[PDB]
Amino acid sequence: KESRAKKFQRQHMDSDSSPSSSSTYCNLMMLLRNMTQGRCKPVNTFVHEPLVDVQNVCFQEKVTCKNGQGNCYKSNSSMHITDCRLTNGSRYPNCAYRTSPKERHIIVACEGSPYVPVHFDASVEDST
Ligand SMILES: [Cl-]
Ligand SMILES: [Cl-]
Ligand SMILES: [Cl-]
Ligand SMILES: [Cl-]
Ligand SMILES: [Cl-]
Ligand SMILES: [Cl-]
Secondary structure: OOOHHHHHHHHHEOOOOOOOOOOOHHHHHHHHOOOOOOOOOOEEEEEOOOHHHHHHHHHOEEEOOOOOOOOEEEOOOOEEEEEEEEOOOOEOOEOOEEEEEEEEEEEEEEEOOOOEEEEEEEEEOOOO
8 A cells, every 4th residue: 555655655655775777677666666567567767866856856946847837846956766667578577677877866756744755757958
């Protein structure tokens, strides 16, 4: 049983690991974070920053969510992230991933009291 805030942490936070993800990082992390149970989650982004830094994004630049609804916020700073993409050849229960580390501003949807990230919306390179 999982709140949206807890689901966000499980799926998208990886505060305590190195930014330069090796080629097997997503294979290991998608499994460890329960994103290969029932189905292979096709795409996922992990953020290698402190929780407080990601939570604080809810109080940074307000931007439009990709679907035009909800309240989204773009980080002031470029953060260490890793994109994970399900390989073409993969099929449940065999879930293989390509790992792509990068530094990007994150855009998250926020809600609740406390007002916290509940959805990873997008990442972008450009500031402002
Ligand atoms: Cl950083
Ligand atoms: Cl790609
Ligand atoms: Cl990518
Ligand atoms: Cl999400
Ligand atoms: Cl980009
Ligand atoms: Cl792009």
